[PDB]
Design a protein around this motif. Structure first.
Motif, short mmCIF file in Angstrom:
data_model
loop_
_atom_site.label_atom_id
_atom_site.label_comp_id
_atom_site.label_asym_id
_atom_site.label_seq_id
_atom_site.Cartn_x
_atom_site.Cartn_y
_atom_site.Cartn_z
N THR G 1 -31.29 12.63 -72.24
CA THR G 1 -30.15 12.78 -73.32
C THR G 1 -29.61 11.57 -73.30
O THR G 1 -28.07 11.90 -74.26
CB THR G 1 -29.45 14.34 -72.82
N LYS G 2 -30.04 10.78 -73.13
CA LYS G 2 -29.36 9.67 -73.43
C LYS G 2 -29.36 8.55 -74.99
O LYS G 2 -28.34 8.40 -75.04
CB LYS G 2 -29.58 7.97 -72.41
N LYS G 3 -30.36 9.15 -75.87
CA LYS G 3 -29.91 8.66 -76.83
C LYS G 3 -29.20 9.84 -78.05
O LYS G 3 -28.72 9.09 -78.85
CB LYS G 3 -31.92 8.48 -78.27
N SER G 4 -28.55 10.89 -77.41
CA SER G 4 -27.22 11.58 -77.85
C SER G 4 -27.06 11.46 -77.52
O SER G 4 -25.87 10.89 -78.52
CB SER G 4 -28.21 13.13 -77.38
N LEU G 5 -26.67 10.43 -75.86
CA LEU G 5 -24.61 10.52 -75.51
C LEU G 5 -24.54 8.76 -75.86
O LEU G 5 -22.82 8.47 -76.66
CB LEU G 5 -24.76 10.31 -73.66
N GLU G 6 -25.49 7.83 -76.23
CA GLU G 6 -24.57 6.91 -76.85
C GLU G 6 -24.43 6.75 -78.13
O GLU G 6 -23.74 5.53 -78.46
CB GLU G 6 -26.02 5.94 -76.45
N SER G 7 -25.35 7.21 -78.78
CA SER G 7 -24.67 7.60 -80.71
C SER G 7 -23.78 8.24 -80.44
O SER G 7 -22.82 7.19 -81.42
CB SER G 7 -25.93 9.17 -81.07
N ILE G 8 -23.31 8.90 -79.59
CA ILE G 8 -22.08 10.08 -79.42
C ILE G 8 -20.61 8.94 -79.77
O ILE G 8 -19.38 9.16 -80.31
CB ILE G 8 -21.46 10.82 -78.46
N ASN G 9 -21.35 7.53 -78.34
CA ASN G 9 -20.52 6.59 -78.21
C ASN G 9 -20.26 6.18 -79.93
O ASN G 9 -19.04 4.86 -79.90
CB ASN G 9 -20.34 5.89 -77.39
N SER G 10 -20.98 5.71 -80.23
CA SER G 10 -21.51 4.68 -81.34
C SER G 10 -20.38 5.70 -82.55
O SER G 10 -20.07 5.33 -83.41
CB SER G 10 -22.88 4.63 -81.87
N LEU G 12 -17.87 8.30 -81.85
CA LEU G 12 -16.74 7.60 -81.74
C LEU G 12 -15.55 6.08 -81.92
O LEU G 12 -15.11 5.99 -82.14
CB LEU G 12 -16.24 7.95 -80.79
N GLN G 13 -17.42 5.12 -82.35
CA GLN G 13 -16.71 3.76 -83.08
C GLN G 13 -16.43 4.04 -84.39
O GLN G 13 -15.34 3.92 -85.02
CB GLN G 13 -17.95 2.95 -82.30
N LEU G 14 -16.82 4.94 -85.14
CA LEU G 14 -17.06 5.38 -86.32
C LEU G 14 -15.40 5.26 -86.87
O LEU G 14 -14.52 5.25 -87.50
CB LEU G 14 -17.93 5.77 -86.80
N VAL G 15 -14.97 7.14 -86.33
CA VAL G 15 -14.27 7.48 -86.57
C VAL G 15 -12.92 7.03 -86.09
O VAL G 15 -11.80 6.49 -86.84
CB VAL G 15 -13.75 9.05 -85.37
N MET G 16 -13.00 5.98 -84.72
CA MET G 16 -11.43 5.27 -84.73
C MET G 16 -10.94 4.37 -85.37
O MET G 16 -9.98 4.04 -84.87
CB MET G 16 -11.88 5.00 -82.83
N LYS G 17 -12.06 3.40 -86.17
CA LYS G 17 -11.67 2.67 -87.20
C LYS G 17 -11.57 3.29 -89.04
O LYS G 17 -10.68 2.08 -90.20
CB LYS G 17 -13.27 1.28 -86.95
N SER G 18 -12.18 4.55 -89.31
CA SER G 18 -11.78 4.42 -90.09
C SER G 18 -11.37 5.82 -90.39
O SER G 18 -10.67 5.97 -91.49
CB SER G 18 -13.69 4.43 -90.95
N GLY G 19 -12.19 6.99 -89.79
CA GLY G 19 -11.34 8.15 -89.96
C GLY G 19 -10.66 8.57 -89.50
O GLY G 19 -10.12 7.65 -88.72
N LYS G 20 -9.38 9.48 -89.77
CA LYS G 20 -8.33 9.94 -89.22
C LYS G 20 -8.74 11.31 -88.65
O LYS G 20 -9.66 12.15 -88.16
CB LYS G 20 -7.34 10.59 -90.77
N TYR G 21 -7.48 10.38 -87.39
CA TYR G 21 -8.18 11.80 -86.18
C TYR G 21 -6.61 11.96 -85.03
O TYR G 21 -6.40 11.40 -85.13
CB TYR G 21 -9.29 11.38 -85.40
N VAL G 22 -6.46 12.62 -84.31
CA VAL G 22 -5.80 12.66 -83.23
C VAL G 22 -5.79 12.69 -82.25
O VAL G 22 -7.33 13.05 -81.77
CB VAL G 22 -4.64 14.09 -83.86
N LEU G 23 -5.02 12.29 -80.89
CA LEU G 23 -4.59 11.79 -78.94
C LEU G 23 -4.54 13.10 -79.17
O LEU G 23 -2.54 12.81 -78.97
CB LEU G 23 -5.02 10.27 -79.81
N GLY G 24 -5.11 13.52 -78.84
CA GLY G 24 -4.30 14.47 -77.64
C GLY G 24 -4.03 16.21 -77.62
O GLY G 24 -4.65 16.37 -78.40
N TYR G 25 -3.23 16.49 -76.39
CA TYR G 25 -3.33 18.07 -76.73
C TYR G 25 -2.75 19.55 -77.92
O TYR G 25 -2.99 19.76 -78.63
CB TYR G 25 -3.02 18.34 -75.24
N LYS G 26 -1.30 18.70 -77.30
CA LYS G 26 -0.31 19.12 -78.47
C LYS G 26 -0.45 19.23 -79.28
O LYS G 26 -0.69 19.90 -80.70
CB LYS G 26 0.84 19.15 -77.99
N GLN G 27 -0.49 17.38 -80.14
CA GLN G 27 -1.42 17.57 -81.69
C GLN G 27 -2.27 17.88 -82.08
O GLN G 27 -2.10 18.63 -83.41
CB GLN G 27 -1.36 16.18 -82.21
#
Ligand SMILES: [Mg+2]
Ligand SMILES: [Mg+2]
Ligand SMILES: [Mg+2]
Ligand SMILES: [Mg+2]
Ligand SMILES: [Mg+2]
Ligand SMILES: [Mg+2]
Ligand SMILES: [Mg+2]
Ligand SMILES: [Mg+2]
Ligand SMILES: [Mg+2]
Ligand SMILES: [Mg+2]
Ligand SMILES: [Mg+2]
Ligand SMILES: [Mg+2]
Ligand SMILES: [Zn+2]
Ligand SMILES: [Zn+2]
Lengths: 136, 25, 99, 97, 212, 80, 103, 91
Positions: G1-10, G12-27
């Motif tokens: 499943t290593k090609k699955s996980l490493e994709s997800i970090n890539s 999460l590299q996309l949405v971190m810089k371009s998309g809009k997203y929230v960080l935490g539980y209450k938010q």
RNA sequence: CGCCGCUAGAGGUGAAAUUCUUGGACCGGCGCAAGACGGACCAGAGCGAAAGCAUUUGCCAAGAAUGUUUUCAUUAAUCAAGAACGAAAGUCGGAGGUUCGAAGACGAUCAGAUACCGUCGUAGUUCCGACCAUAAACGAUGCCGACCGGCGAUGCGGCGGCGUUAUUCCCAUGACCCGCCGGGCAGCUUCCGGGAAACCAAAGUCUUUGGGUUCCGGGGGGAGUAUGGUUGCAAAGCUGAAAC
């Protein structure tokens, strides 16, 4: 004795283990069951000396005796299992086992098929030479 | 006398010379 | 859970001597018996206690699975008399080793 | 100087080969240095098979062989007279007839 | 002294389906004292080969047959193992081939769990000068999968009368040769060794039905 | 004696890619003409991605060390 | 499943810089009651009351659930900030395809 | 600053108790006093209570671990075996 | 070790003796438990920076090569200090402890043996976390590059060769067969020349001497010794004279 089996021409089979060291010789008649030894003559009985106990003369005199004790008890044929001390020591059978096979064929005791069961290890734990081995 | 056992005797001598130094410092 | 329902090789602790005595063998901090060599009929079980002597016990008795916490306690040199003294002050007066 | 270009063994790309415990003196010699042979010795010497061919139940269907990885070291090789001396051009030479 | 006049002499009925049902004779004290006669009868083994039990299969590829029970001078047996000889296993082993083992712990349909090995060599293809002829060590990983496939699915859902009959012409070892030529050609593939390890129940009703 | 300036074009195909005098590479563009709907696909022969056409939307090349191979009934040439 | 996980970090590299997203539980509870979030990410050691609570807001608002296969510390490193974080949401993935690939 | 250049934490016993003893306590006074990284609350407030008890400040969840370290070589290995004997085809 | 059988010897060596034996040794038989180690396949084969690495299967990252009409545009080589890896041997604690086996004790063999030989046997071998940094750690040949003869193979990739053969038969790859390319361990021959010679395709392109760069030797002895510093728990390491 009326013995095991009569109406021969179909032989009664035994198993002749032969255990050739380089300095002793066994001939050991068993049946096919494995547990029931009929006869066990060594080279160490027939030789009064203490170094010709591996000779062909050691073996063939051991071979006469077993074939005589097997002529009494009515069994006819003998398969042949064959070996030497195969743990870490040598693996060739000694200069006696290749001669006891001759003398079993002479004095009665017709022959089955012959197999070479010398236990060949895989791991090969340390053999008793040391580093630099045997000297002279 | 081999250079092997010549090194061993220079060692054995030096170790006693060492324990003589550390004795009477 | 009982030893007849665990497979052999199961490292347990606090197992019982004869069933229904509520936990006797291998209780101390960092000890473990290991169930080996079941007997299907004649419901018995060989166990290696933390000495090494394979006792055979009746197999209706239960053993909490795992080693006792506190493993490798004694690896600290006590190293001063007071810390030798306080260890045995909570236990009992067994301290006076007067030869 | 160099008596050989091999320097005896046949470690050429490696750095370490496992030693094989010798048969006679049981001195551990690395196997690319050791003298090495393979004997298909018959289980009964051929003078005495004719005894056993005529004392057998079968129609000489039983013929078994005895295989030994027979493994020497270079001290006990010449000591047992296998690996004769040769000459300064004859050390270059390869497989026997 | 002659204790060999005290000893009684059973003969051993073989099982079915080989070609013959008599093997030889044994020795046992019939009885005396606390002892029972059938004390020793239940565990004596036999290592007797083929080419007397088959009307000419291969003369090597022995079997391990242990004496099972007692029945009125005809003590009787059951399957316990298959072996081969040290010479023929060391025969067909050349320095310039490659030996590929496969072995699997596997349950039969009924309660018998057997471990059977397997041995194959790669084959020097005809029209060849390049004398090495080895396997790339990935196709060795593939061909261990090939044998551990078939030796599961021709043993796991089968019985002893299925699988001991697969031993005699080596119907498994011939089929692994035919299936796996597309990976590499092979050369004299045999099972080599089969060893029993779990025998749950005695079942002499199953034992006699195995004979008649 | 030997020639350098005018070798044989037999000789220089045999020699390595960057070992001849002009060093022009050994790949080619191949004209994969799949029967999908309409489209002629120019595609590098020594490819590295699964070349998926946009009309038919299936595989046209396999990524393989060396050069790609084609799947089923795909014909090609060179554009020169 | 290593090609699955490493994709997800890539991923999460996309949405971190371009998309809009929230960080935490209450938010991510406010964004999940608005119907606004697209894909919730769950770190692995979050307390089991909080875990199955966020699931229950997901099955109401029909928002995709993902269990990140990792401790909450390296979820923070996956989302590229030095603190640690259990619960994220992806409230406008512009160029991303997280909400595309597994759903 | 590198104040004591060899002993580290065992500059408190000082002159005495023997050399190889203090070498062999230094490795294991460090281990029981460190702020281990908690697997539950995510923080590094793993602090031991009395011997064999470990304790995290946030979420206040108390775990029995090793006697001086948090784990043991025994602890990982028996956790390795007990799952392995669990997934052995129904127990 | 527990039992079934058999029975007077059984290992042991050029011989013998110590050692095990009618209380059952050895030798056959069925099992059982422990630890080391992976035999034959094994090669003038592979990979590794070196020491090194061999049962299968999973798991984890890593790498050379090959193919590249991808990419940044000199990011390079070799290195005083400085750092990590470093067989076996040892040192420290932890688990167990089969075989081999320093010392140790014994039997011979010799004039002498405390030696080879034989029998019993610690520490050690083995696994786990620390140490130590030496070897014939040898291609006894610094590393990068450029060039100068051939052939025969081979190991790993790549392309081509409508001659076979396995799925089912176009359809792919297998399996050989004849190639050409790259880099790789090696080889054969040669008067390229070099070499004091053995020998060497690099030990060549050197009195027709200058590619770049690091470590070093300067008659044997005394000696890597004395003494200093420096590291090592220790055993010892690195640096290193002089008198004569
Ligand atoms: Mg005391
Ligand atoms: Mg006192
Ligand atoms: Mg010379
Ligand atoms: Mg070496
Ligand atoms: Mg005694
Ligand atoms: Mg520099
Ligand atoms: Mg070591
Ligand atoms: Mg100490
Ligand atoms: Mg201690
Ligand atoms: Mg001993
Ligand atoms: Mg190729
Ligand atoms: Mg350098
Ligand atoms: Zn030798
Ligand atoms: Zn916590």
């Amino acid at each position: 004795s009326l013995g095991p089996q009569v109406a021969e021409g179909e032989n009664v089979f035994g198993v002749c283990h032969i255990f050739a060291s380089f300095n002793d010789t066994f001939v050991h008649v068993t049946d096919l069951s494995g547990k029931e030894t009929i006869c066990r003559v060594t080279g160490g009985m027939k030789v009064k000396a203490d170094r010709d106990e591996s000779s062909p003369y050691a073996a063939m005199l051991a071979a006469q005796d077993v074939a005589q004790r097997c002529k009494e008890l009515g069994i006819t044929a003998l398969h042949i299992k064959l070996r030497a001390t195969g743990g870490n020591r040598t693996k060739t059978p000694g200069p006696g086992a290749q001669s006891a096979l001759r003398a079993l064929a002479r004095s009665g005791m017709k022959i089955g098929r012959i197999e070479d069961v010398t236990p060949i290890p895989s791991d090969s734990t340390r053999r008793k030479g040391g580093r630099r081995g045997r000297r002279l | 006398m081999r250079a092997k056992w010549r090194k061993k005797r220079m060692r054995r001598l030096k170790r006693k010379r060492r324990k003589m130094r550390q004795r009477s410092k | 859970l009982p030893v007849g329902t665990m497979p052999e090789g199961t490292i347990v602790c606090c197992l019982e001597e004869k069933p229904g005595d509520r936990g006797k063998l291998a209780r101390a901090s960092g000890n473990y018996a290991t169930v080996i060599s079941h007997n299907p009929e004649t419901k018995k079980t060989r166990v290696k206690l933390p000495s090494g002597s394979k006792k055979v016990i009746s197999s209706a008795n239960r053993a909490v699975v795992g080693v006792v916490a506190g493993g490798g306690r004694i690896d600290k040199p006590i190293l001063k008399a007071g810390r030798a003294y306080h260890k045995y002050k909570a236990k009992r007066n067994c301290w006076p080793r007067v030869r | 100087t160099k008596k050989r270009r091999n320097n005896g063994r046949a470690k050429k790309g490696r750095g370490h080969v496992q030693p094989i415990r010798c048969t006679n003196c049981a001195r551990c010699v690395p196997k690319d240095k050791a003298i090495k042979k393979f004997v298909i010795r018959n289980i009964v010497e051929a003078a005495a098979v004719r005894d056993i061919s005529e004392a057998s139940v079968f129609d000489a269907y039983v013929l078994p062989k005895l295989y030994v990885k027979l493994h020497y070291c270079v001290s006990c090789a010449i000591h047992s007279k296998v690996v004769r001396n040769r000459s300064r051009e004859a050390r270059k030479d390869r497989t026997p007839p | 002294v002659d204790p060999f006049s005290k000893k009684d002499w059973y003969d051993v009925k073989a099982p079915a389906m080989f070609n013959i049902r008599n093997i030889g004779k044994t020795l046992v004290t019939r009885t005396q004292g606390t002892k029972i006669a059938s004390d020793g009868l239940k565990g004596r083994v036999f290592e007797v080969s083929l080419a007397d039990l088959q009307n000419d299969e291969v003369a090597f590829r022995k079997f391990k047959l242990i004496t099972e029970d007692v029945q009125g001078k005809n003590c009787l047996t059951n399957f316990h193992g298959m072996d081969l000889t040290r010479d023929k296993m060391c025969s067909m082993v050349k320095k310039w081939q490659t030996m590929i083992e496969a072995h699997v712990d596997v349950k039969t349909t009924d309660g018998y769990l057997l471990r059977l090995f397997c041995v194959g060599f790669t084959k020097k293809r005809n029209n060849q000068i390049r004398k090495t002829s080895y396997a790339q060590h990935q196709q060795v990983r593939q061909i261990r999968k090939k044998m551990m496939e078939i030796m599961t699915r021709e043993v796991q859902t089968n019985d002893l009368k299925e699988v001991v009959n697969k031993l005699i012409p080596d119907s498994i070892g011939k089929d692994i040769e035919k299936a796996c030529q597309s990976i590499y050609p092979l050369h004299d593939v045999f099972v080599r060794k089969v060893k029993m390890l779990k025998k749950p129940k005695f079942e002499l009703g199953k034992l006699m039905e195995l004979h008649g | 004696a030997k020639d350098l300036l005018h070798p044989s074009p037999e000789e220089e195909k045999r020699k390595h890619k960057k070992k001849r005098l002009v060093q022009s590479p050994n790949s080619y563009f191949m004209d994969v003409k799949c029967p999908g709907c309409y489209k002629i696909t120019t595609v590098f022969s020594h490819a590295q991605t699964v070349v998926l056409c946009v009309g038919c939307s299936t595989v046209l090349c396999q990524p393989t060390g060396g050069k790609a191979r084609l799947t089923e009934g795909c014909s090609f040439r060179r554009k020169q | 499943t290593k090609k699955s996980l490493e994709s997800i970090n890539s991923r999460l590299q996309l949405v971190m810089k371009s998309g809009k997203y929230v960080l935490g539980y209450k938010q991510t509870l406010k964004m999940i009651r608005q119907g606004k979030a697209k894909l919730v990410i769950l770190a692995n050691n979050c307390p089991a009351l909080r875990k199955s609570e966020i699931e229950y807001y997901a099955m109401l608002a029909k928002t995709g659930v993902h269990h990140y296969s990792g401790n909450n510390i390296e979820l923070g490193t996956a989302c590229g900030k030095y603190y640690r974080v259990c619960t994220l949401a992806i409230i406008d993935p512009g160029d991303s395809d997280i909400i595309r690939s597994m759903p | 600053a590198k104040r004591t250049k060899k002993v580290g934490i065992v500059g408190k016993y000082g002159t005495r108790y023997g050399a190889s003893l203090r070498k062999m306590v230094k490795k294991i006074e460090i281990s029981q006093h460190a702020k281990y990284t908690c697997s539950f609350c995510g923080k590094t407030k793993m602090k031991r209570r009395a011997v064999g008890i470990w304790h995290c400040g946030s979420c206040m969840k108390t775990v029995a671990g090793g006697a001086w370290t948090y784990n043991t070589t025994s602890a990982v290995t028996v956790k390795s075996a007990i799952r392995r004997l669990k997934e052995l085809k129904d127990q």
